[PDB]
Amino acid sequence: QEQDIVFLIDGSGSISSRNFATMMNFVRAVISQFQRPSTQFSLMQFSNKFQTHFTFEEFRRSSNPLSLLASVHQLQGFTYTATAIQNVVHRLFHASYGARRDAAKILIVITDGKKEGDSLDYKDVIPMADAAGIIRYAIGVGLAFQNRNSWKELNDIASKPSQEHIFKVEDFDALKDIQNQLKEKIFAI
Numbered sequence: 001q002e003q004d005i006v007f008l009i010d011g012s013g014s015i016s017s018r019n020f021a022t023m024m025n026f027v028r029a030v031i032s033q034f035q036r037p038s039t040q041f042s043l044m045q046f047s048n049k050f051q052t053h054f055t056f057e058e059f060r061r062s063s064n065p066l067s068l069l070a071s072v073h074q075l076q077g078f079t080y081t082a083t084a085i086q087n088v089v090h091r092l093f094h095a096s097y098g099a100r101r102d103a104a105k106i107l108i109v110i111t112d113g114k115k116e117g118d119s120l121d122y123k124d125v126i127p128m129a130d131a132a133g134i135i136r137y138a139i140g141v142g143l144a145f146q147n148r149n150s151w152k153e154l155n156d157i158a159s160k161p162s163q164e165h166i167f168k169v170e171d172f173d174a175l176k177d178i179q180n181q182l183k184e185k186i187f188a189i
Contacts, residue, residue: 002103003039003189004056006092007031008084010111011045011075019172020074023110023141026175028069030108033183036060040103042092043069046084047077048117052091057098081115081157086125089134104189105132108182110139112172114153122156135159135189137182139167141175 007027011020031041040060043053054068062068088107093099107129129136138157144150145168158165164185167178 001038001189002100003034003106003186004042004093004099004103005034005039005106005108005186006042006044006088008088008107008109009043009045010047010079010081010109010113011077012047012079012112013076014079015074015112015172017074019112019141022172023175024069024072026110026172026179028066029176029179030182031069032066033179034186036065040098040100041065042097042099043072044084044088044092045072045075046080046087047075048080049075049077050084050087051075055092055097056100060098078117079111079113079115080118080120081109081111081153082118082120082122082125085109085122085129085157086120089125089129089132093132093134105134106137106186106189107134108137108139109157110141110175112141113144114150126156130159135165137165137167137185139169139175139178139182141169141172143170
């Protein structure tokens with residue numbers, strides 16, 4: 001079963017250079033657990049700005065896909081998670097970007113904090129993501145995601161059942177600890 005998977009990663013200034021590098025190592029590790037052509041990937045980074053590092057078409061045609069993750073520079077800035085999801089949902093899965101009609105559409109969001117200053121609300125972008133059948137995973141990095149204020153954030157982003165689509169890790173160095181878990185979740189789709 002074909003899968004078109006988008007990684008949407010936060011590049012806000014709150015993320016240290018060391019942690020950003022660690023996050024990219026995690027993305028590379030997860031991608032390395034899958035094989036083309038069944039699974040294809042696309043990567044967008046967000047802050048208050050948005051950058052598509054590679055589309056599904058670029059990943060598909062590449063003779064060395066993992067290299068497309070070699071020159072990813074951190075954007076810095078704020079964290080407009082809702083608008084970022086909107087940008088992914090309304091662009092990265094287009095046929096013109098290399099997406100496949102019959103493929104399962106999956107979005108993996110990695111963030112170190114709640115959205116702040118975003119002019120869009122989750123209720124403004126999630127309903128459409130659900131209509132498109134986009135399966136969403138929310139990965140929250142930081143002890144703050146242990147409370148309620150930040151917990152609800154992951155629930156608003158992730159597909160239901162929430163528990164099966166959310167991951168809370170204490171720090172960026174702990175991302176590697178959920179690689180197998182995340183892989184198993186996706187392989188089950």
